[PDB]
Amino acid sequence: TPVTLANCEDEPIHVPGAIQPHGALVTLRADGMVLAASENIQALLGFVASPGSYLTQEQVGPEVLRMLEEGLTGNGPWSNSVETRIGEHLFDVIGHSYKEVFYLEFEIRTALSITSFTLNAQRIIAQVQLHNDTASLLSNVTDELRRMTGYDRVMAYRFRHDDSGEVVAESRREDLESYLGQRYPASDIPAQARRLYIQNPIRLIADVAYTPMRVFPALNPETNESFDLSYSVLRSVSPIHCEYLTNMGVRASMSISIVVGGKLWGLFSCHHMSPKLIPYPVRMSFQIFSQVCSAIVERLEQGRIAELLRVSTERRLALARRARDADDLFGALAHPDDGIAALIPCDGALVMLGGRTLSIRGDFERQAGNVLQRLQRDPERDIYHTDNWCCGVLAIRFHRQESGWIFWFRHEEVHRIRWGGTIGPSGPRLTPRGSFEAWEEVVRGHSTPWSETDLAIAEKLRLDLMELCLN
Amino acid sequence: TPVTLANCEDEPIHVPGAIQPHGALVTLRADGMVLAASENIQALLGFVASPGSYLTQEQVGPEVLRMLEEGLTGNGPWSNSVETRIGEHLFDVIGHSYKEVFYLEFEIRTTLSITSFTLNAQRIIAQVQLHNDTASLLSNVTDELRRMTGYDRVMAYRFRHDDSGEVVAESRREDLESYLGQRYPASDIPAQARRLYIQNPIRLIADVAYTPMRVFPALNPETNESFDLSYSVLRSVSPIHCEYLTNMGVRASMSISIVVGGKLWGLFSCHHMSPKLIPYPVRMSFQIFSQVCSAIVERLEQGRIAELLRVSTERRLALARRARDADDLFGALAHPDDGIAALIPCDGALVMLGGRTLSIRGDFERQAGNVLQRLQRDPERDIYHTDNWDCCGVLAIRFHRQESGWIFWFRHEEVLTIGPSGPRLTPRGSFEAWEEVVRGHSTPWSETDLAIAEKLRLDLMELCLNHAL
Ligand SMILES: */C=C/C1=C(C)C(=O)N/C1=C\C1=NC(=C\c2[nH]c(/C=C3/NC(=O)C(C=C)=C3C)c(C)c2CCC(=O)O)/C(CCC(=O)O)=C1C
Ligand SMILES: */C=C/C1=C(C)C(=O)N/C1=C\C1=NC(=C\c2[nH]c(/C=C3/NC(=O)C(C=C)=C3C)c(C)c2CCC(=O)O)/C(CCC(=O)O)=C1C
C-alpha cells in the first residue's frame, strides 16, 4: 500500500524491505543459512550471497564466521561488531539477532582517539555540576555535541506528556535559521518510529536523497512475512520523512536518544546540509552520551520536583501561622507572595467558604458556579481537574457542610517564544511552519496540563484546611 | 632516610622515582628531549635512547611521534593514547604532561579497540541509571564490578567527615572473610594518597610482591629535584602499603574513585589474592564511569538532604499546629514521630522552659544543667554544639531568654602472619587505631542538622513572642 498522509500513522518503517546503500545486509536463520541480502552485496563484497547458500571463510573471513558462530549459540540476544578486511577494502562488520532471525551489516572503514573522548566527557560532567539545570546541560551538551561531530546543526528536544516535543536547545551554523522554541505535535513522530527511538540509542541516516537498496528476497520464506529490520543499522527511512528533510534542505541525520524508564524523554537531533556519515565505533561512543544524559536528567527532574516540593511546603506552613493567628482564612490565602495564587502555577484562583467568594487575580465567580453544578452529579468527589472547558480547573473540597472549596484556572497553552521579522508534492504540511500549525489545532482549547506535582500539593493543602477548618 | 610508621604520613609517594615492572617510562621535556628512563627499557622496547638523546624514530614509530609532536605544540595539561608495535610486541602508548615535564608510558597489549572501551562502559554506567537509593548504587556497582573483572573481592568505601572510611559494600568469594562495616582511621590514607586518589580516578597495582624498577636519572637536570609523577599509571607503590597488603594476603589492586566536588567521598576497592592486570582501554572504560558515578552520587546526596529538609519543614508544621491550637508548647514537642524527638537524629533530647523540663529517652536534665552552667560565660550564645563533653554530643538552642527556653539533642559515643614494622598494619590493627581516634567523640553535627535546629529556634521565637495576645 502507498504511503501518504492518511497512512503515515501506521506506515511500517521497520519492515521496508529496503536499506541505505552506505553498507550491505545479509540475513541468516537459526543455523546460518542466507535467507536474503541487499542486491548490492557484490558491490564491494566480491562474492554472491545466493538465497540458500551458506557462510564460507572464502566469502567472509575467519573473524566474521568466528563471531557469527558465537551468536547462533548465544545465550542472550546476540549483538556484536568486528573490523576485518573483506575483499580489497576494510569493513566494519556488525550483526545482531531479532525474533528468530539473524542479521549482518557491512560498513566501509572511513580512515578516533579514545582518551580524547574520555577527556572532554569531563568538560560535560564538570560544566553541568556547577550549574544544576536540565535546561543548561541540554543547552551545554548540545554545544559540545556540535564540536565533537561537526554536524551543521544539532538540536535537543524535550518530550511533554503528550509526546509533542519542543526545541529547548540548539547550536547551528549562523548561516542557517533557528528552530529554538519550536513546538511540533505528537503526529510528527508516529508510535512505530518513536518505539524505534527507544529501542535504538542512535539512529543514522547517511543520505536523504538516497535510492532505496531493497534486499531480496522480499519476504523471508520461513515465516512468509516481511523481515523485521527494527534493530537494523542500515534500515531504510520513511519516504514521507525523506521529503520532509529535503524540504528543510537537510541531507543527513543522527539521533542520540534520552530514555527515562520507558519514555522517550528527549533526543539530540543532528542535521547536515551535505551527505555526512560517521564510522560505527564512533556511534557506539555517542551511544554513551545517550545514557549519561538519561542519567543526569534522571535526577535533575527528580531533584527539581523536590525543590517545588520544598518551597510549597514552606509557603504552606506560612499559612498555618497566618490563618490561626487571625482566624478567618480569607486573609492568609490571598497573600501575594505566599498563598494559593502562587502556590500552584495558575492564571487565577478562587476561595469559597460559606457564601464568601474571594477571586484572586480575576472574576472567576461565574465559572466556579458551573464547576460546582457539575459537581452535583459527583457528590463525595473531593477533587476535580480538567484541561478543557478559561479551560483549566483544579478544585479541592476541604469542608462539606459549608461549601468549602478552592479553584485555580488556566488559559490555552501560550507559545513561550515565537519568531518574526522548497516545496514538495505531498503538500506544505511537511515543513516547520506546517508542523507548528498542526500543533496549534491540537492544543486549541487545551490549558497547560496539571503536572504530577501541581496535584500532589492540591491534595496537601486540602489536608491542611481540613484540620484547620474543623477546629 | 627510610620510611617508617612515623614518616609514612608524609611519605612523598608522588615522586618515588621508580615504576612498576610491567611497563616502561620515558620522561621528556618541552622540546622533546629525553630526560630519563626506567631501567627496563631494553627488556621491553627493542631500543635504548640515551639521557639527552632526541626522538629516536627507531624506537617509537611514526604514529607516536605524531602524538608527541602535537603535545609539544600546545600548552596546558596534555593527554592521549595510541596503539602500535614497538619491538617484538605491541603496546598502549599512554602519555601525559604534568607541570612542565612529559611522560610516555608503555603497557603490553594481550582485541576490540574502539568497541571494547565503549562496550565495557554501557555495562556499568547503566548500573547507575537503575536505582534511587544511594546505598543501592554502592551495593550494586560493587557486585557488577566483581563480575566484569573476576576480582577475588571488591569493596565500596564511604568517607565520613573526619575522613575515617567505612566499608559499606562487598562481594568477596565464600572462602575469604568479611570486611563489612569495618572502620579505619583517616590516617590509613595519608595526605598525598587522598590527593592522588582524587586527581586520579583509577589506581592499579599489578604485583604487591613486586620489585621496583627504578627510573634513572633520579634528579631532573632542569630543576635539580625529583620527578613528579602524580598523573602516572605505573608509579611505584609505598613500601608501607605493600607490607599492608601482603599482610592481608593481597597482591593485586584496582580502585575506582568517587569525588563529590573537592572531597574524596569514597571509592571502590578491588582486591585480588594473585597478580592481576587490566587493559588500558578497559581502565578508561572505568575512569569515565568514575566521573559519571561521582556525578550521580552528587545528585543522590543533594537530593537526599533536600528530602530531609522537606520532612523537617513538614513536622515543624506538626508542632506549629499542635502548639497553636493549644497552649501546650511541651505536648507538641513531645510527640513520638513529630517534634524534637525525631526532628534531628539523636540518642536523646531535652526541652527547658522555666522550672519545667522533659527528657525523651532518658535523664538528660542533669547534663543540660551543666551545659547551661558553662553557657553563663558568654550569655549571648543562642546556638551551641560539639561532640566532646557524659552523653557526649550536645546540640543546644535558645528560644526564650527571659525564662531560659532551651532545646537539647544528645548523642552517645560512636558504637597470625606479621610485618617487619608491627601488627598495626592490619585490618584489626586499624579498627583499634580508629577506636582511639573517635573515643570521646560522637557522630558530628551535619551542615543539615544545624540548618534545622536554627529553623526550629526561629520557629519557637515566633510562637513565644506570639503570646503577646
Ligand atoms: C505522519 C508521519 C510523519 C510526518 C508527517 C513527518 O513529518 N514525519 C513523519 C514520520 C517520521 N518522523 C520521524 C522523525 C522525526 N520527525 C520529526 C518532525 C519534525 N517536526 C519539526 O518541527 C521538525 C523540524 C523543525 C521536524 C524534523 C522529527 C523532529 C523527527 C526526529 C528526527 C529528526 O529530528 O530529524 C521519523 C523517523 C524516520 C527514521 O529515522 O526512520 C518518521 C518515520
Ligand atoms: C602512614 C602510612 C600508611 C598506613 C599506616 C596505612 O595503613 N597505609 C599507609 C599508606 C597508604 N595507604 C594507601 C591506601 C590505602 N590504605 C588502606 C588501608 C586499609 N585499612 C583497612 O582496614 C583496609 C582493609 C580492611 C585497608 C586496605 C586503604 C583501604 C587504601 C586505599 C586503596 C585500597 O583500598 O587498596 C596508600 C595509597 C598507595 C598507592 O596506591 O599509592 C598509601 C600510600
Taking an 8 Å cut-off on Cβ atoms, the answer to whether B114 and A282 are in contact is yes
Whether A179 is in the pocket of ligand 1, judged by its Cβ within 6 Å, is yes
Closest CA to A56 of A86, A77, A98, A83: A86
Specify the amino acid at residue A49.
Answer: A
Longest dimension (CA), chain B: 94
Specify the amino acid at residue A369.
Answer: G
Is there a contact between B389 and B373 (Cβ–Cβ < 8 Å)?
no
Whether B430 is in the pocket of ligand 2, judged by its Cβ within 6 Å, is yes
Query: Helix, strand, or coil here: B205?
Result: strand
Cell numbers 608522588 correspond to B14
B177 DSSP assignment? P
The B37-38 sheet, strands edge to edge: B18-19, B213-216, B37-38
Whether A435 is in the pocket of ligand 1, judged by its Cβ within 6 Å, is yes
Longest dimension (CA), chain A: 92
Which residue in A122, A281, A471 is closest to B115 by CB distance? A281
Exposure class string for A118-138: b at 16+ Cβ within 10 A, else e: bbebeebbebbbeeeebeebb
Helical spans, DSSP H, in B14-61: 41-44, 57-60
On the 0-12 / 13-18 / 19+ scale of CB atoms within 10 A, B285 is buried
Whether A253 is in the pocket of ligand 1, judged by its Cβ within 6 Å, is yes
Whether A26 is in the pocket of ligand 1, judged by its Cβ within 6 Å, is no
Is there a contact between B292 and B201 (Cβ–Cβ < 8 Å)?
no
Is there a contact between A257 and A269 (Cβ–Cβ < 8 Å)?
no
Helix (H) / strand (E) containing A204: strand A202-205
Which residue's CA is the nearest one to ligand 2's atom 32? B269
Could you tell me the distance, in angstroms and rounded to a whole number, from the CA of residue B429 to the centre of ligand 2? 13
Helix (H) / strand (E) containing B353: strand B348-353
Whether B237 is in the pocket of ligand 2, judged by its Cβ within 6 Å, is yes
Residue A154's Cβ-side half-sphere holds a number of Cα atoms within 13 Å equal to 21
Specify the amino acid at residue A23.
Answer: G
A183 DSSP assignment? B
- Residues in B closer than 8 angstroms to A256, CB to CB, are none
On the 0-12 / 13-18 / 19+ scale of CB atoms within 10 A, B162 is middle
Q: Please, what sign has the CA dihedral across residues A262, A263, A266, A269?
A: positive
Domains along chain B with CATH numbers: 1-14+109-211+237-302+417-440 (3.30.450.40), 15-108+212-236 (3.30.450.20), 303-416+441-469 (3.30.450.270)
Note the ligand closest to the C-alpha atom of A6: 1
Q: Which residues contact A257 (CB under 8 A, 6 or more apart)?
A: A197, A198, A200, A201, A202, A203, A264, A267, A290, A294
Which residue's CA is the nearest one to ligand 1's atom 26? A432
Which residue in B119, B288, B320 is closest to A121 by CB distance? B288
Is there a contact between A272 and A204 (Cβ–Cβ < 8 Å)?
no
Radius of gyration of chain A (CA): 28
Whether B140 is in the pocket of ligand 2, judged by its Cβ within 6 Å, is no
Note the ligand closest to the C-alpha atom of B200: 2
Q: Resolution of the coordinates in A?
A: 2.9
Q: How far is CA A122 from each of CA A115, A118, A356, B293, rounded to the nearest angstrom?
A: 11, 7, 59, 12
Backbone angles phi, psi at A408, to 5 degrees: -130, 145
Whether B193 is in the pocket of ligand 2, judged by its Cβ within 6 Å, is yes
Phi-psi region of A153 (alpha: psi -120 to 50; beta: other; left: phi over 0): beta
Taking an 8 Å cut-off on Cβ atoms, the answer to whether A471 and B317 are in contact is no
Is there a contact between A51 and A217 (Cβ–Cβ < 8 Å)?
yes
Helix (H) / strand (E) containing B365: helix B365-373
Cα–Cα dist A214/A234, whole Å: 11
Backbone angles phi, psi at B86, to 5 degrees: -135, 100
- Report helix angle B280-322 to B447-464, nearest 10: 10
Peptide bond into A217 cis (omega under 30): yes
Cell numbers 572505568 correspond to B286
Closest CA to A79 of A280, A294, A289: A280
Which residue in B81, B298, B466 is closest to A114 by CB distance? B81
Residues in the annotated binding site of A for a tetrapyrrole: 8
Closest CA to B62 of B47, B82, B41: B82
Whether A193 is in the pocket of ligand 1, judged by its Cβ within 6 Å, is yes
Helix (H) / strand (E) containing A357: strand A356-360
Alpha-carbon distance B381 to nearest alpha carbon in chain A (angstroms): 27
- Residues in A closer than 8 angstroms to B292, CB to CB, are 125, 292, 295
Query: Helix, strand, or coil here: A140?
Result: helix
Which residues on adjacent β-strands are paired with residue A270? Answer: A154, A254
Mutate one of B83, B129, B465 to test the A interface: name it (highest A CB count within 10 A).
B129
Phi-psi region of A68 (alpha: psi -120 to 50; beta: other; left: phi over 0): alpha
Residue B450: other Cβ atoms inside 10 A: 15
- Residues in A closer than 8 angstroms to B295, CB to CB, are 125, 129, 296
Whether B8 is in the pocket of ligand 2, judged by its Cβ within 6 Å, is yes
Could you tell me the distance, in angstroms and rounded to a whole number, from the CA of residue B206 to the centre of ligand 2? 16
- Residues in B closer than 8 angstroms to A300, CB to CB, are 299
Strands B225-226 and B252-260, bridge-based pairing: unpaired
Whether A251 is in the pocket of ligand 1, judged by its Cβ within 6 Å, is no
Closest CA to A408 of A392, A389, A397: A392
Residues in the annotated binding site of A: 8
Residue B363: other Cβ atoms inside 10 A: 10
Taking an 8 Å cut-off on Cβ atoms, the answer to whether B295 and A324 are in contact is no
Which residue in A113, A284, A296 is closest to B81 by CB distance? A113
Could you tell me the distance, in angstroms and rounded to a whole number, from the CA of residue A203 to the centre of ligand 1? 12
Closest CA to B309 of A303, A329, A91, A366: A303
Let me know how many helices (H) and strands (E) chain A has, helices first.
13, 19
- Residues in A closer than 8 angstroms to B121, CB to CB, are 288
Cα–Cα dist A290/A264, whole Å: 12
Closest CA to A334 of A317, A321, A322: A322
Cα–Cα dist A38/A26, whole Å: 7
Which residue's CA is the nearest one to ligand 2's atom 21? B427
Cα–Cα dist A229/A98, whole Å: 8
- Report helix angle A454-470 to A318-326, nearest 10: 30
Alpha-carbon distance A316 to nearest alpha carbon in chain B (angstroms): 9
Cα–Cα dist A124/B30, whole Å: 29
Closest CA to A292 of A198, A169, A201: A201
Could you tell me the distance, in angstroms and rounded to a whole number, from the CA of residue B275 to the centre of ligand 2? 18
Helical spans, DSSP H, in A213-314: 239-248, 280-300, 305-314
Exposure class string for A40-52: b at 16+ Cβ within 10 A, else e: bbeeebeeebeee
Which residue's CA is the nearest one to ligand 1's atom 2? A8
Cα–Cα dist A15/B178, whole Å: 54
Mutate one of B321, B455, B458, B460 to test the A interface: name it (highest A CB count within 10 A).
B321
Which residues on adjacent β-strands are paired with residue B358? Answer: B351
Closest CA to B176 of B160, B196, B156, B153: B153
Cα–Cα dist A109/A90, whole Å: 6
Cα–Cα dist A197/A287, whole Å: 12
- Residues in B closer than 8 angstroms to A299, CB to CB, are 132, 296, 299-300, 303
Q: Which residues contact A238 (CB under 8 A, 6 or more apart)?
A: A3, A8, A11, A13, A16, A193
Which residue in A115, A309, A310 is closest to B81 by CB distance? A115
Could you tell me the distance, in angstroms and rounded to a whole number, from the CA of residue A301 to the centre of ligand 1? 26
Closest CA to B8 of B187, B234, B251: B187
- Dump strand ranges (E) for B64-188: 79-85, 90-98, 101-108, 153-159, 165-171, 183-184
Cell numbers 480569607 correspond to A330
Could you tell me the distance, in angstroms and rounded to a whole number, from the CA of residue B184 to the centre of ligand 2? 10
Angle at B408 between CA B406 and CA B412, to 5 degrees: 160
Which residue's CA is the nearest one to ligand 2's atom 2? B8
Which residue's CA is the nearest one to ligand 2's atom 39? B237
Which chain B residue has its CA at the smallest distance from A298's CA?
B129
